[PDB]
Design an enzyme around this catalytic site. Structure first.
Site, mmCIF file in Angstrom:
data_model
loop_
_atom_site.group_PDB
_atom_site.id
_atom_site.type_symbol
_atom_site.label_atom_id
_atom_site.label_comp_id
_atom_site.label_asym_id
_atom_site.label_seq_id
_atom_site.Cartn_x
_atom_site.Cartn_y
_atom_site.Cartn_z
ATOM 1 N N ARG C 53 0.790 -1.211 0.000
ATOM 2 C CA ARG C 53 0.000 0.000 0.000
ATOM 3 C C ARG C 53 0.838 1.283 0.000
ATOM 4 O O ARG C 53 1.660 1.480 0.870
ATOM 5 C CB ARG C 53 -0.869 -0.011 1.246
ATOM 6 N N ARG C 100 -6.443 19.319 7.956
ATOM 7 C CA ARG C 100 -5.245 19.243 8.781
ATOM 8 C C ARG C 100 -4.880 20.520 9.505
ATOM 9 O O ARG C 100 -5.228 21.621 9.064
ATOM 10 C CB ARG C 100 -4.069 18.719 7.964
ATOM 11 N N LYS C 246 -13.402 2.981 0.387
ATOM 12 C CA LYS C 246 -13.062 3.106 1.799
ATOM 13 C C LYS C 246 -14.214 3.743 2.524
ATOM 14 O O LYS C 246 -14.715 4.799 2.108
ATOM 15 C CB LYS C 246 -11.811 3.981 2.001
ATOM 16 N N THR C 304 -6.475 -0.690 9.940
ATOM 17 C CA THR C 304 -6.157 0.326 10.943
ATOM 18 C C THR C 304 -6.095 -0.174 12.378
ATOM 19 O O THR C 304 -7.028 -0.752 12.925
ATOM 20 C CB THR C 304 -7.029 1.561 10.810
HETATM 21 K K LIG Z 1 -5.131 8.275 2.586
HETATM 22 MN MN LIG Z 2 -8.708 7.566 6.664
#
Ligand SMILES: [K+]
Ligand SMILES: [Mn+2]
Ligand SMILES: O=P(O)(O)OC[C@H]1O[C@](O)(COP(=O)(O)O)[C@@H](O)[C@@H]1O
Ligand SMILES: O=P(O)(O)OC[C@H]1O[C@](O)(COP(=O)(O)O)[C@@H](O)[C@@H]1O
Ligand SMILES: [Mn+2]
Ligand SMILES: [Mn+2]
Lengths: 501, 483, 506, 514
Positions: C53, C100, C246, C304
């Site tokens: 990945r 962010r 996702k 995760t």
């Molecule tokens: K990402």
């Molecule tokens: Mn994420």
């Protein structure tokens, strides 16, 4: 052992049944069985419901039959612990169609050319003449319309329709006043004829306990039976007979409105093709089980016994399979009304049921029933399923309900406990009508009420227990599940206690 | 929908049986009919074939050798009358039904009267009778309708009728007549021996021995007809090719209330073992005399199908009655409805689950084929089989799709009727030079016969099962083809 | 595995029952500083990595070209023996619409501590984009002060820092702690309107195609149209690319069924998901999506924090071990590693652990219930391929097949077999190098790249490939003499014509 | 709500877990929290009670008798602070966790709160020499189990600190083990050591353990989590030590090693229930295997109807961070979904910076997980497996559960003297809450050991007329029920009670509407 399904089967002959059989037995009263003495015999052999078939005989003739059943029955009131009540069921005539009077036998011959509704000709029946009691026949049966006489053993095809030119398709030996059938033809003949209304009033007047209502085709049909039954007869249980295509198609509607069902295989078996009744039968029994209403399987279960002292391998098999299907009651007709072996017929039904009942795979059954049954909020069902469950957990010998109208007992049987449901009630009628529910065993309680309630309850329970031991349902050491109510009256069943004998 | 398409449970299942759901599909339960005066005629036989007879039963309790040679001559003649059309030709098996250790009786017997065994005198062809029926020993006569305590149940006695001595025990499984009978069988190439009164493994051994070398091919179906037979069932089953639940005798030897248990139990066990089981006797009696069966008889037929039976029988009904063809049509019609009522779901799961692991490529291919069949509602499974064995393996699992079996072995094409849901096709062409091509010709043969008979229509998927090399025992491939 | 119930089943899990079998849940490892080195990559390949990945939230285009160059290099180092060669897929992980914090006040690597109970200002002010302090953070999502109400939560840095909204938003520090430069911001219960596809994302995707990545893990997928874009961006040159959506927020969860229909598979992005919705609820989200995916027969990825503490310690905690096993037992096709292999001190060791747990969890599957359950739920089908597939699986069970050997051109046939979760290994032979990569996305499939040029006579070509699978099979210890194997192939060359099942003995 | 749409199969089931299905219902998995410096203060305790702690664990691996007498003094104090309203008072159990045959390193060289680094490839010495009790350093660890030097053979492995540190023993010797560090790291004071494969002749019951247990009785702890239980006889001792004064104490056997796992069936039979001690267990056996051990024991426990506890590291990172990792969240849920009766917290509430927050989280996960159980399969499965019984109490119990399901009962209200009846009900895993009314304060505490039971301590003195006493208790349950939001008007409730006073006479089930 025997108690998967395959597996189950594979483990079913020396395993002696042991237990009150629970499928109650209905026997039709007729010349072969109207005598107090014969009736007593049939009671001993296991009859629970007495059927009066109003297609035949006069009002006076049936008042005799009732007089006698009642007589045979009460002859055992000498010991309250052992007294078996017996229900009485009026079977309605409804829109039958029938041929005239001829015990001589005209032979109707294959291929030979006449159905008539001419008054004068109403006994002039011959090898070429048959007269029938439904005038409209000549208008409702078209060219190449098929007509059936006597249990469908006789067949005629209409070929010219002023006065019905038919040709005998299937001939045979025709007798006096016999069932006629016009399938594929719409009979505008009413569900409730004047005679039927009289018949029903008679019913109430004499306190029959159940109306098997013939030819029910639609919700409104049972409404009438109710209306006719009139105010004096709200307690009467109305069991709708399903006997033709329409009935089968509107089954769901009929079931909703009725107290239960009878699978009238006789008529049904001519109105729809013969290969199909099984489906109709297994289907309605299923649905009935699902709704928790009595269902009755009927007609020809044991025919040859009308004439022979032993049934055929198929009839034995039929009886078993009806029980294994889930039928609450099984019936006898020709077998006990006219035949030479009425008591022996009753004994056989009693014997088959007991074996069939031991072969039920309750496991699958109860799970299946639980699973299917929707949630409910009525304390009575709640207690009931609760009771059944406790019953399985400990191999309860029996479940002893106190019931006023039978309704609590019914709820128990809905779930098919294996333990016997011993129902105690003061309502003589209730104790009769409850035979309509597989696995229930009524006990009529006679004593006057105690002053302190509870005590009255305790007396009844203990009454059930005592009658229990006496009849060999329960022995010392057994556990029994007791179901009762928080206050007197009906609709308040709400308690389950676990007691040891 | 059709064929009872409209569940998760059995209850549920039942609740959805619909009466207008027209069956659609070759019925599977094959029908056995006993040959007799009412049905020995070539023309009558042709009629019964059209109606659906698949096995012809010769009842060696009656008639001479010559009389049966006539019946076989005729069946064969009726059958071959259709060989005009290989795509449509229905083979028909021939089953010898053994006489075995019967006891028989050339007036009314009155209730309460004395009757001597040797109006009040009946002579019997089992001499030892006076030695094995003690005081209080019940003697039954004619289909158990007449009763005698050493007369309890009276009735009309005819000439030479079945006699039974329940609770009493010696008479040999194989009498000299039985051996002659069996040799006759081989000599005339019967395909199946329904062996009467089988009580123990060794009993079928004898039938095999008698059958002799010339007859290893003959399938031996053991008749269960008495207590002992019931108790030693598990042993009998192991040694036999399959079973008949002979309810007639059985139904006198043990209490009547009990036969249903015997029947449902044996059928279960047979299903488990994958051997043909036959349900027999009185399935449709009244039709011996009337053109319509009683509601119980209808019911009996269905429940035998729904129990799992591979074949259903007819006896009085086609041997002597006035409605032989009409009896065959009825069985055919009930079977078809009962067959659409099977809850394969539960059934296949149940069979899978129960069946132990196996390592034989044939079984492996078979269960796999079945499974594929379900996934797509395959119209049919087409097997190429030398001895039938692969077709049998498939039916074992009870596909809903039809098992069309192609074979050059005329006999195999016959014996396969013993297996629910199989439909044999006899293949006549000589082998091709290149193998594969021979295979392809056979498959295509099966397909073509398939369309012609209405098993499969354009658009259907079919599951084809075949082998990697010629000969038997090498079935090992499953292909999925579209029509 | 032979018990009649699930309870029963459970009660018979044995700790000395040595697993024996190719593990089947494929492992996805994120490439980072801790693992960019050809040598380290070779190590990770040996340990069981199957997919690589590339996390485009970080690093430049050149930096990833280097990662790919290297993976490819590590991988091909084993091309010396075609029978052993393990392909490895490469997955582009999209940046998508993040939010962010800034660069800390005077410090592209320094730390401010946010104190519990203190006031803090969150600004959107261009000037402040670099001016981040103890009572001040700036963020690059201007709308925040318009979408976050009074008493609304703001989580910062992986959700480990927490603010409640009591020119700028007045916030109390709920959860305090040590904050660094440019870190993730989450607004749960709040709705974001930032685009799924930003210009950067499109460039990133083109990059992907250009370099022949095999899989796009597409971040923040909220709706069918979101995957449309990824496809459009992916452009013509990239139809072969598998797009795995996702699921990372409420909306994604609510529109799951639509997203699933349009995607080739799913990733349960538990990180973001686990802040956007309450933490107590992710398990539900995860067990639900994996169920649904199984049902549809599309790859599903669990991701995760599966092994976090291993970023720092050489042994995982009892919960992480447990998490991995449960993900496999849930039905996940792949499990992932992130911090664990991108930055941490024990990347190879983390891969080894996932490999070890999966193998045990896989032996604990109650296939019985599973296969029945799948069969039962799967609708009839008419496609010869599925038909052959379920038929093959079934034959497999009947004989404890050592493996099923499919010849597949685009992987499709192998996928169909895995759908049903055979216990036997699915050995897929293919000439399409890319297919052999993308197939890792399917539980229990093991790709073999076939290199020889076609034979003249077809059949023979088939036979060579089957035999190829067999041979690679023995060599790798999938099958031993005496085993039976189930072989699935087609009647003519090309894809979509799979239709035969044979049963062969080794 | 309560995951109602979530079904004919398990697959199906899963596929219908809805994230907006707000849980609604007392969480039933009770929570155990270890008491320690981070949580010994009355005020902090009160906080943890509010958050959902049900059992308080005193870890006798650490601290002196006096130190624990303080902890109990405090729990008791925190708890009774709520006695001001009997309808809402939450009892809280107290559990003594035994030291047992643990092995430990010394205090660190002058660094009580300091550390040493043990380096990959170097030579460490293991010493039982008393002189070095407290002289430990980069090349020296002294250990408190003397025989270690006679039990760890050459080539034998030694683990320190939760298995994170590793030594291989290469040289035996007249003053200790000459080890080469196989796994290194930051070592702290007095940390646990494990000798896997090397069998530890160390007794289940050391003198200290016996004193510890007597202490327990003396102070009326309610539950002994007994460490390192390897065999039936081990729990016998705990009982013997527990002495006559302590028959009431529930003994939960900790399974922490291979042997424990192999003799589980025997241990289960003899114990009141189990704890899957995954810490030790997770080093004694390979880490990849614990899950199997855990799911297996929980299954067996469920089957036998004894409480089973899942423990250790469920929420570690919360020792340091205010939010758990995605795996820890997941771990909690799967323990509940596995069937665990209680879940535990250790480091998380004994030392860390977020003890309350850790409790809150377990409370919150459990509630969601509890709405995900596929009771259908579960109850069928339990019914099916459970053998016939003849004890009126079980009979009433299963029957009550069944009635419960039929109507979506809001709750089952039992009147129980020793908790036994409430235990029997939970055994079958009703979905409805089991509200247990009892005058035995202890019983009210010990019942937390049983999934889905919620104890109510009844304070009033008995009525003259029995029945009336019964009615008052039921009504007491009901009232506390509405107040705490278990039941609302319109609900049905299933009431279970007895024909006469005393224990062991439960035998009636009534169906009442609220
Ligand atoms: K990402
Ligand atoms: Mn994420
Ligand atoms: O007729 P139902 O609805 O079954 O009622 C059963 C009834 O029997 C009882 O147990 C006793 O009834 P009685 O005392 O009025 O005879 C009641 O508690 C309950 O209401
Ligand atoms: O009779 P069985 O045992 O079912 O054998 C089936 C046989 O049929 C075949 O498909 C073809 O056999 P033939 O070529 O002899 O007809 C073989 O592959 C297989 O061995
Ligand atoms: Mn009628
Ligand atoms: Mn016979």
């Amino acid at each position: 052992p025997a108690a998967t399904f395959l597996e189950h089967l594979c483990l079913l002959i020396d395993s002696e049944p042991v237990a009150a059989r629970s499928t109650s037995i209905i026997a039709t009263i007729g010349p072969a069985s109207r005598s107090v003495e014969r009736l007593k015999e049939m009671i001993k052999a296991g009859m629970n419901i007495a059927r009066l078939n109003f297609s035949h005989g006069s009002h006076e003739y049936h008042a005799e039959s009732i007089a006698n059943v009642r007589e045979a029955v009460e002859s055992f009131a000498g010991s309250p612990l052992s007294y078996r009540p017996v229900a009485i069921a009026l079977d309605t005539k409804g829109p039958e169609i029938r041929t005239g009077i001829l015990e001589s036998e005209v032979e109707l011959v294959k291929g030979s050319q006449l159905v008539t509704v001419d008054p004068a000709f109403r006994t002039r029946g011959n090898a070429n003449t048959v007269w029938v009691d439904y005038p409209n026949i000549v208008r409702v049966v078209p060219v190449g319309g098929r007509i059936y006489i006597d249990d469908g053993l006789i067949s005629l095809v209409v070929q010219k329709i002023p006065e019905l030119v038919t040709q005998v398709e299937n001939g045979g030996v025709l007798g006096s006043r016999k069932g006629v059938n016009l399938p594929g033809a719409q009979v505008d003949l009413p569900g409730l004829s004047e005679q039927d209304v009289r018949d029903l009033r008679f019913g109430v007047e004499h306190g029959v306990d159940i109306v098997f209502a013939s030819f029910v085709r639609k919700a409104s049909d049972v409404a009438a039976v109710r209306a006719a039954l009139g105010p004096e007869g709200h307690g009467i249980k109305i069991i709708s007979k399903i006997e033709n295509h329409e009935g089968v198609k509107r089954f769901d509607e009929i079931l909703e409105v009725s107290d239960g069902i009878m699978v009238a295989r006789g008529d049904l078996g001519i109105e729809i093709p013969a290969e199909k009744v099984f489906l109709a039968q297994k289907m309605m029994i299923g649905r009935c089980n699902l709704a928790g209403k009595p269902v009755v399987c009927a007609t020809q279960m044991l025919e040859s016994m009308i004439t022979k002292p032993r049934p055929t391998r198929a009839e034995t098999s039929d009886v078993a399979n009806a029980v294994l299907d889930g039928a609450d009651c099984i019936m006898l007709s020709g077998e006990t009304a006219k035949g030479n072996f009425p008591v022996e017929a009753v004994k056989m039904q009693h014997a088959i049921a007991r074996e069939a009942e031991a072969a039920v795979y309750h496991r699958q059954l109860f799970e299946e029933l639980r699973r299917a049954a929707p949630l409910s909020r009525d304390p009575t069902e709640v207690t009931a399923i609760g009771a059944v469950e406790a019953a399985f957990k400990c191999c309860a010998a029996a479940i002893i309900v106190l019931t006023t109208t039978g309704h609590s007992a019914q709820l128990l049987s809905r779930y098919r406990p294996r333990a016997a449901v011993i129902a105690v009630t003061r309502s003589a009628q209730a104790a009769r009508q409850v035979h309509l529910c597989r696995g229930v065993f009524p006990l009529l309680y006679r004593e006057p009420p105690e002053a302190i309630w509870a005590d009255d309850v305790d007396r009844r329970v203990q009454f059930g227990i005592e009658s229990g031991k006496l009849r060999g349902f329960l022995r010392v050491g057994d556990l029994v599940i007791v179901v009762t109510g928080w206050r007197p009256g009906s609709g308040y069943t709400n308690i389950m206690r676990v007691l040891s004998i």
